[PDB]
From a paper:
With the exception of a subset of lipoproteins that carry a transport avoidance signature and remain in the inner membrane, the majority of lipoproteins are destined for the outer membrane. Their transport is directed by the Lol system that comprises the inner membrane transporter LolCDE, the periplasmic chaperone LolA, and the outer membrane receptor LolB, itself a lipoprotein. Following maturation on the inner membrane and extraction by the LolCDE transporter, lipoproteins are passed to the chaperone LolA that carries them across the periplasm prior to insertion into the outer membrane by the LolB receptor. LolA and LolB share structural homology, both being incomplete β-barrels with a central hydrophobic cavity closed by an alpha helical lid, but perform distinct functions. Here, we present the crystal structure of LolA in complex with a lipoprotein, providing a molecular description of the interaction and a rationale for the capacity of the chaperone protein to transport evolutionarily divergent lipoproteins.
Numbering used by the authors: 1 to 182, 187 to 192
The structure:
């Protein structure tokens, strides 16, 4: 079925580097943003996403901490990865328990798959992925409630082209750090 076919394809890949092009389209049909950069990924939950143009930004997951680094304003935020990837198909990679796949209705047209959550209250209501029978990922998208779609076209996929340093982040000299992992709050 679509689910088994999609899992069988993604199962072929463990790590890669790829370059990406991003297109954000609003439901109006206007492409409201375009960008490019590099992605390194390593199972189960490690990634380094670096948007180089137009507005530089770095997301690094060591599998527990997600760092967001804006080099333009020299600000880095440390968050828990689990707080950013919840209610997405991230768990299909990071955990890959059979019942995780059962959260989504998955439909196939060739190398194109569409994942629709069955019982989510989240903002993301659709995912798409184009992945060849060899596990090469060509495209991915996510759709928000207002129909804003964030789409990624991957090129130059190279499996195994990652080192462990890509998945570690130490704030550079002079970078302001907001560590949201660590003043207690009074409530009515
Ligand atoms: C499909 C089958 C299973 C694959 C599942 C992958 C799920 C990816 C979700 C990533 C979580 C988002 C973290 C950003 C925080 C955020 O800002 N949240 C919300 C965002 S709301 C709007 C939108 C929504 O965000 C996105 O969907 C980003 C998509 C970009 C990734 C495209 C490459 C595809 C790679 C798939 C690889 C499979 C692995 C194969 C084997 C290794 O935001 C954006 O597009 C901008 C943010 C881009 C930053 C993405 C970098 C994460 C790449 C993670 C890929 C690693 C996958 C597993 C690791 C082994 C918010 N702002 O509230």
């Amino acid at each position: 079925d679509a689910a088994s076919d999609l899992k069988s394809r993604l199962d072929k890949v463990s790590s890669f580097h790829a370059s990406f092009t991003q297109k954000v389209t609003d439901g109006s049909g206007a492409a409201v943003q375009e960008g490019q950069g590099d992605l390194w990924v390593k199972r189960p939950n490690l990634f380094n996403w670096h948007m180089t143009q137009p507005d530089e930004s770095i997301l690094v997951s060591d599998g527990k901490t997600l760092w967001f680094y804006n080099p333009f304003v020299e600000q880095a935020t440390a968050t828990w990865l689990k707080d950013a990837t919840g209610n997405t198909p991230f768990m299909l990679i990071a955990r890959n328990q059979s019942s995780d796949w059962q959260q989504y209705n998955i439909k196939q047209n060739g190398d194109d798959f569409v994942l629709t959550p069955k019982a989510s209250n989240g903002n993301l209501k659709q995912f798409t992925i184009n992945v060849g029978r060899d596990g090469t990922i060509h495209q991915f998208s996510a759709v928000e409630q207002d129909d804003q779609r964030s789409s990624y076209q991957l090129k130059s996929q190279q499996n195994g082209a990652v080192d462990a340093a890509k998945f570690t982040f130490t704030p550079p000299q002079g970078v302001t750090v907001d560590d949201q992992r660590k003043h207690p709050q009074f409530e009515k």
